[PDB]
Amino acid sequence: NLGRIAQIIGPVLNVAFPPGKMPNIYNALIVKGRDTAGQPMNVTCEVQQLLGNNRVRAVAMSATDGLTRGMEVIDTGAPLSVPVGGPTLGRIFNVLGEPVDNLRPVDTRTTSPIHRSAPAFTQLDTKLSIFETGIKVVNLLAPYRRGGKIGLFGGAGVGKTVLIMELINNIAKAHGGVSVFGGVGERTREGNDLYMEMKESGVINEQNIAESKVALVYGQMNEPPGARMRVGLTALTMAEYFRDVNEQDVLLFIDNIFRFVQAGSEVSALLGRMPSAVGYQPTLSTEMGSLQERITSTKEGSITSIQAVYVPADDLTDPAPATTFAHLDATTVLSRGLAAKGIYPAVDPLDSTSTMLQPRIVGEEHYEIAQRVKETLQRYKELQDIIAILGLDELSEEDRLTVARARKIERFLSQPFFVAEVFTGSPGKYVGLAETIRGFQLILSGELDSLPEQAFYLVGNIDEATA
Template sequence: MRMNPTTSSSGVATLDKKNLGRIAQIIGPVLDVAFPLDKMPNIYNALVVKGQDTVGQPINVTCEVQQLLGNNRVRAVAMSATDSLTRGMDVIDTGAPLSVPVGGATLGRIFNVLGKPIDNLGPVDNGTTFPIDRSAPAFIQLDTKLSIFETGIKVVDLLAPYRRGGKIGLFGGAGVGKTVLIMELINNIAKAHGGVSVFGGVGERSREGNDLYMEMKESGVINEQNIAESKVALVYGQMNEPPGARMRVGLTALTMAEYFRDVNEQEVLLFVDNIFRFVQAGSEVSALLGRMLNCNVGLSICMWLSFDECDLLCVYSHATYMYIINLHMFFLGFFLIFLQ
């Protein structure tokens, strides 16, 4: 269940009132943490592990609570590597979900799942953050009227028009023109509709993310000279990152897109590349949490989506004032799993 939108002054909630627990067990990217009985954290709360490893290097690992195990323990999924963690280390309950920066300051920048910039351009000059776990728009806010979004690409508008507030899948292998189409759509929504775009790279290779960033700079979608004039914000959860980060990076991108829609009242294009690796990450986390339903891969993934991650697929709902139009990038082999 997603929470109502709020703002916060820091990326991962303030740590003034520390609710401390201790690591009881580490299973790869999953932590079991024991807390006092009267101070158990809520589901989706952010936990922070700070300290030093055996060679004196600082440790700062953020996790998200996924299960209440009983016996004063919770199970959390780490958003970064847990190699340096040990049993008995202190864990801080922040008392709030993961929060990420939002607004115009995010345009032209690259962020990770925690909303921290990873483009070596310095910190984000923005004090507004939103939690990534929030509720979908209420039914009374939804617009049931059908309308077509004019992309400015004639073949798309004629043969496969995009619906405002809808979801579109782009199917194709390497080198067929998906990136070219993305660039054109980002330019068109900015120039013709006064909108912006958010790109969520879920589980893709670092090289592909870098290539996309360079192409966006060359095409002018990202303005190096005046970063505020950029038309897109980028959020990456790359292939080398733990499954928790790859599973949640889609919600980070969605949170940034919702701010542009709800607060700035702009139309937004939200790209998710690709949804296969998003589901793959969720399947990995489900196995670690003991939620693997059966040996049928397709059924397991479908059930996991219906129980846990329907938010990412459903909260694109368009409100009565502005819209989020979502484009998924699909790997064709993913659908062969369901067709077998």
């Protein structure tokens, strides 16, 4: 159609069509003129409201600097179509599905709407398989159910990225299937890095023989709000293809899905609604929900999204990160105080769950020890404030044992990374289930009551903790 721009207040455009033309909600519009002497069509917007009076509101996916009132807008006749399929792997995409990797145009078969209805209730599954990661805290205290949606929480700078990397190292590189990494509201470096690294490891096309098993979609910090509120949906429209069309088992690595919400808070008040708890939009739960139940495992295939979430000011109560939890078969809440101790990955052994923490899906040895380990971690934690002032001299010989052992647990629960070889300074170690399960069993048994604490700190296996 052909409407005219009427108001440009920041990333929000109030286009005006005739009483006949009325772009549907979520149907994308496109404006014709913009930057410093030159005519480009980069200015794409998404209809989100019919203000009435022959006028729709919309948020642009591109910067609206240079735009003018009167400029012609056009109704594409549907929503924003991202090209999907195999011809996406090894490339880098825009929020608008445009190659940003400078390797020629994208030769796709078909495009695809970022706005699709989640699977029907009868297209779901209940199979619960494990996902051995290699971290002495994940697979033992909070596993990963395949098809499941993992929540990796933590505050500003705690290790979530380094965490999403060792997962791409321990699981994606070797994964027998395709993967996808969504660039939702983060550092550009964290893009170039992941790129040049995934290049050397050969995940990307060393040569265009096209053996790649990964597809990237980057919408970093600098981008406007109406971009990172959606690059998640581009990274996912491409994932909602490999899952049901090629019946593959895909991985969806979203580095921070909070930035998806943050950017959502920014268009809200800017659109004309009324803020909610902690300045967040009234539509906080309708937005991070519709795009978190498409990120899932259906009978047609699977989607095992290892997602990360930013926690504003270390507060879990905060609406944005708290909202995520419900959509997770596990969690991994990283601490800043436990990070201030040098224990990495800074994972609170107490605050990190997983539905598959059941003897009916993993084992009793895996089950018991898991709890046994946390029991003491509850003990010492409840003994801290006590001994920190009441000393130890009057503590029973049956309780001073909890201390030593726990401190040997809290330290054996420390493991360097193949990516963090620059923060630890020691060679990394992949620690699967069995090696972890037994190692701790030998701890909870007091068969190592002689070994010092710093013997379990930054060690691979229990043997490497007796060495």
